[PDB]
Amino acid sequence: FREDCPPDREELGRHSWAVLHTLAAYYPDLPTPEQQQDMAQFIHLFSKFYPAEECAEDLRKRLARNHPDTRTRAAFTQWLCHLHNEVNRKLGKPDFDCSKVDERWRDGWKDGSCD
Amino acid sequence: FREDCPPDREELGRHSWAVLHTLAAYYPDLPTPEQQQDMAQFIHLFSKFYPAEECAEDLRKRLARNHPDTRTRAAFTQWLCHLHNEVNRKLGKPDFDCSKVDERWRDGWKDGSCD
Ligand SMILES: Cc1cc2nc3c(=O)[nH]c(=O)nc-3n(C[C@H](O)[C@H](O)[C@H](O)COP(=O)(O)OP(=O)(O)OC[C@H]3O[C@@H](n4cnc5c(N)ncnc54)[C@H](O)[C@@H]3O)c2cc1C
Ligand SMILES: Cc1cc2nc3c(=O)[nH]c(=O)nc-3n(C[C@H](O)[C@H](O)[C@H](O)COP(=O)(O)OP(=O)(O)OC[C@H]3O[C@@H](n4cnc5c(N)ncnc54)[C@H](O)[C@@H]3O)c2cc1C
Ligand code: NA
Ligand code: NA
């Protein structure tokens, strides 16, 4: 009932993916070498500080197995979608369809249901 | 009505402050020099990538005037609260009472209304 309270593991995850997917959606289609490096470092630093040491450590192992592809907006948005799907799978959640990431996180559904 | 849609400026801000205030709340009381540097860089990289170039640029100017104090959890949580209050003030919102940051973003209100 109270709005207004510290977020739990789930509520923080939901905020975090919204922040992550949204930053990804507006990342350049042709980023400079510096921007590519800055985004890889950003994702790295995010995994260092994400609290709940059960979620961050799993995440750092996952990122060690699978480095952020920050080459282009296309590559980075799909990479992040596939990353997020590994966590969905681990938690018994269904795969999100990565072809929809632009509609979900930038443009809105092509049927206009976000209008 | 649809849940489920790309976040607007306001919804993204609300997610972003929740992510920022929550990362701050669990930052060490005695962070290593490396962690202090990693958090300052984290905040910097966040302002580089925050989308909507009207909000990010204002933010980068604000951070140029006012460097993240990442010395301790106490210092960093209060600094971030004061940062957020500058944005509240700019938008005609009232000041949030920074003594409440722990209750709001870590522990819950001492009256137990988050229980
Ligand atoms: C980096 C990270 C690591 C985490 N690790 C763990 C963990 O180890 N264990 C744990 O219990 N929880 C972890 N969480 C929390 C967890 O992933 C969820 O956020 C939480 O369980 C709530 O799930 P949900 O059903 O609300 O949807 P979420 O998984 O929060 O997703 C939010 C929304 O994003 C959209 N979406 C779903 N998948 C994708 C995708 N692949 N690409 C783009 N958009 C998508 C859907 O619209 C969905 O409603 C983590 C969260 C973060 C951001
Ligand atoms: C880095 C950043 C920069 C932004 N810059 C702009 C901008 O230039 N122009 C613009 O129109 N919008 C900007 N926004 C969006 C804006 O700050 C708000 O997020 C949005 O207007 C929604 O406001 P709100 O009333 O939902 O509460 P928000 O400001 O989103 O706050 C969310 C919650 O945090 C708590 N809170 C409020 N203040 C503090 C505090 N000082 N310390 C700790 N907790 C607090 C309150 O419980 C509040 O309900 C920015 C957001 C981010 C994160
Ligand atoms: Na998930
Ligand atoms: Na604000």
Q: What whole-number distance in Å separates Cα of residue B15 and Cα of residue B28?
A: 22
CB atoms within 10 A of CB A25: 20
Q: Supply φ then ψ for residue A96, to 5 degrees.
A: -85, 145
- DSSP count for chain B of H helices, then E strands: 5, 0
Q: Under CATH, to which class is B1-115 assigned?
A: mainly alpha
Q: What angle do CA A108, A112, A115 make, to 5 degrees?
A: 80
Peptide bond into B58 cis (omega under 30): no
Q: Residue A66: which residues within 8 A CB-CB, separation 6 or more?
A: A83
Residues A54-89 as b/e (b if ≥16 CB within 10 A, e otherwise) read ebeebbeeebeeeebbbeebebbbbbbbebbbeeee
B17 vs A: CB within 8 A: no
Give the H or E element holding residue B84: helix B73-90
A32 vs B: CB within 8 A: no
| A48 contacts in chain B (CB < 8 Å) | 38, 42
Tokens of A47: 């995994």
Contact B114 A5 (CB under 8 A): yes
First to last CA, chain B: 29
Alpha helix (H) residue ranges in chain A: 9-25, 33-49, 53-65, 73-90, 101-102
Give the position of tokens 């700019």.
B90
